[PDB]
């Protein structure tokens, strides 16, 4: 057969995705999630196609940008694997969590 050592493909994906700018979350599952959350605030709403896209561009920017800071917290603890506690530290320090 053939098998890469674990980490080699992971790194390949990093290079690939930092190179591109396309949205990484599947668009339709995102949209249904947007409309679900919107029903809590006001019932029977509509959404411009671009208005959903604007949300998606801003969620994925946030999240990538969050993972960047999350990774540094793992690295700071001599680790290569991100963990929930890392995300929590990152949000804590940003001023999102208390």
């Amino acid at each position: 057969p053939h098998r890469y050592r674990p980490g080699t493909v992971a790194l390949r994906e990093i290079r690939r995705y930092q190179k591109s700018t396309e949205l990484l979350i599947r668009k339709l599952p995102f949209q249904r999630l947007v409309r679900e959350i919107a029903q809590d605030f006001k019932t029977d709403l509509r959404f411009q196609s671009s208005a959903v896209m604007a949300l998606q561009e801003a969620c994925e920017a946030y999240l990538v940008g969050l993972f960047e800071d999350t990774n540094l917290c793992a690295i700071h603890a001599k680790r290569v694997t991100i963990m929930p506690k890392d995300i929590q530290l990152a949000r804590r320090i940003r001023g999102e969590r208390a």
Binding site: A10, R16, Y17, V64, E68, N71, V80
Partner: peptide, 12 residues
Amino acid sequence: RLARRGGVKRIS
């Protein structure tokens, strides 16, 4: 994928 764009290698 998102974490890969964030530059993350290994994920709990």
